[PDB]
């Protein structure tokens, strides 16, 4: 019974590999490579949009705390749902069909998010865009694997991981070239406003549309047809692959020699039942040790990588904040009287001042604090305030005309006979401000990805030469050693170098994990299992981000120990996995 | 009302601390340190006796399954009752009074257990010995804390755990030096027998007697007298402390400068009511968050620690059992006839044999199984049987002379005209049996405690330097990381190293928890609350042991996940506790 099933699946796999050797590589494989690289580029772009627009988003939607912290977790949760959903649906509907549906959903909801003005609606649109793009990596890898021969199956799959990095580079470049133009205030409707970050979101929603356009021209994988008892169109697809390959070779004169490939409301409930059957069969007697080791490896690597990747920029920001706090100026004791006096003062503290009959017209305040001051018959006009506070201050007969000094900028103050007139529009809470730091953020991201590059090249070249397990274990161990090396970092330059090193060493491990998870599952459960594991990866990413953003400024022992321990456990479970190099893809 | 009570308690605490600073440290504090360390040594010794004597105990009391599994739970339940009882009674009768009572109870019932011959009576005696020793740690910590000044209150209390450490070493040494002499068969009465494990139990009951002898010479804590409205003898005790301290210094000429100190069946029933009230008042408006966080931390830490600590030796035993089974031999089909044939065969299976007129004189059988055999006019003499069975066997005209082949060793057998003569004395049920493994058990226990040592030293040195909460949380997190590291264990050596690591990392956390629970309760509820929490610790120990002994041989994921989750929850609730370093003991 079950033995017969396994046997027949075995000669099916062998015959399919023979047909693939007959067809060979050439134009078809590379064409599909680029076509799927567009979807991976979209996946890579999607994880940078909210991170890049949080400043402007909180400016134009008046976002408080616990709202900026949810806008990254929203995309990660969206991918967590979408990966599982589309991975489950791909084994019953098809790789190309589900990829088209998911990419279309992503594009539509990304456009809609680009045009949303509210916050809750923005959360919903971002979550659904993440759902749409969540099933990109599983379907792409499981769809490209079914067109590659046994020989160079690792190198030909590892070159497919350049596109995530290219998407990251694209996002960084567009953010640098679009967002810095804060002047843009395109108007459509009194109640609504359109700034430049919306344009950035639009441009970052573009490449998914190109992915759909390229994918509509590609044929469904023959293996999916063969599994589901559909023989004729599988043969047609294989013939198309052969014809394209040989026309590209220049001998477009031979004929495909294969005639045949040996073959062995209510609707919603049926689909649910079938998907649950596939998911449970993933937890079968045949697939249990492999499944659990894969779960462990995916979870640990995701936790460590995402935790450190979010930790490095936060630590850079913290070091800059410490420098700023160290440079401040203090002016203890002042007595200014009867003068019109503006200024553009930044990063200052005034204590013990006594101001009488002073006119403050047209001044910019950035990180300026007045403490223990007294203002008496003063006058504030055209005051622009950023990170400015009044603590232990007393105001007597003062007038605030055309100022943004809201109620939250007076901390434990006392106003007597004070008048507020023509208050500027603004947030009811400190929303902080990001200025010149954006350029350095973009530069840091670009450096991270460029550091990723050499590991990609080396892993792609040596994946077949040394092996999947050797690559995975080697890169995991090197990453753990780097995690130890994070102790020797206390400046921005050192943190950038550490980011570069860790990003450059972990990518080989991720490449090996992708190829491994491709090769250890049969063609009737590849997308389901690999999508489930990628959903677990996204959940671990959420957990790791939450855990690692809490150690910035406390100590550097907790991040190092957590990352090193998780990576060591991941390498330990990775060394127990079966070897799949030199094996027919079955 | 209540505010006045809190205030007056406050200046009482402040004046008491001033008096303690005036008295200082010296000979009195170290003398009391050793005196209470004897009681902690007794506590440490008590938890090894049944574990060390279960082999010999089941040999000489014929213990079945469900009886060896209850002889550990009996001591844990005894301590669970005793901790609560003596902690409750200590706040109404006194620390030294209740410690004397509990230690005497422990000693008496330990001697009686040493001389018991039955099982039920042995259960009762061990349970009451556990009850006697249950209130050791609460009263000892809460009694020593009331003689220490603010300055080094953490260091001087953390040195108090080297004692439970050594007790373990003492128990291991005595077990190694006493039990291996199985020859000892001291006889007193025909129906009763005295082996060497009884001598071991006697020697392990000794140190409680020394604890009582040393405790009878120490004075009651002044704080207990001051709380209960008794002023004169509190002043006398403080004067004694001062006099001893200054005589030790070498200046026995100064005078105690303190003259006045601020002061705040039916009998048994009243005391019980008072205890109940104190406990309910713990479910006080002032102490409800603290109480619940303490409950959670104690329960989780006890569950994890005890579960893993019982899991490690069980896993070692399981690995040894697997190795032994992997050594097995099968001899299918035999025909032996007309020969005198002994042997010393271990771990074998004979199937399909046919024996005719065979004499079996003086053979040792260990883990030997005869299946589908036929014995005809056979003769068994001086047969020693261990884990030996006869299944689906037929005996015809066979004689069993001077053999221990009892009725339970013939499984679904058929005897025809068989004769049993001069059967050896022995159990009516299988008892298995432990030989050389005892030395390795003792060595493993010794290694565990020696691994505990460095954590003790470091915690004692750094308790004041870093803080109680930092120490607790740090050690809890490291313990969780170790729980993750239990994945890398598959041999006896690896399991021993893992036991050493986990024991070495959890002890700082336990030290910090003890000191913390000492310092967050007022002197009129210290013993009640701390004893209630220690009773909860023992109940959690029972639950954790029962849960964790069921995962041995199934998988290593359930233990790791349970322990890590519980320790993470414990650390989470530990980080929310108030800081008590740099605070007057109130
Ligand atoms: C280029 C790396 C890429 C991969 N396929 O390994 N990565 C890294 C983490 C998430 C992801 O898709
Ligand atoms: C002597 C240490 C003692 C304590 N009170 O901290 N321990 C450690 C593990 C369980 C226990 O009671």
Numbering used by the authors:
A (entry chain B), B (entry chain A): 137 to 400, 421 to 742
Sentences from the study reporting this entry:
Synaptic vesicle glycoprotein 2a (SV2A), a putative membrane transporter in the synaptic vesicles (SVs), has been identified as a target of LEV and BRV. SV2A also serves as a receptor for botulinum neurotoxin (BoNT), which is the most toxic protein and has paradoxically emerged as a potent reagent for therapeutic and cosmetic applications. SV2 family proteins belong to the major facilitator superfamily (MFS) with 12 predicted transmembrane helices. In addition to the transmembrane domain (TMD) core, a cytosolic N-terminal region and a large fourth luminal domain (LD4) are present.
We also determined the cryo-EM structure of the SV2A–LEV complex without HCA2 to a nominal resolution of 3.38 Å. SV2A forms a dimer, in which the two protomers are in an inverted configuration in the detergent micelle. Thus, the observed SV2A dimer is functionally irrelevant. The overall topologies of the SV2As are essentially the same in the presence and absence of HCA2. The cryo-EM density of LD4 is less resolved than that of TMD, suggesting a flexible movement of LD4 relative to TMD. This is further supported by the higher temperature B-factors of LD4 in the local resolution map.
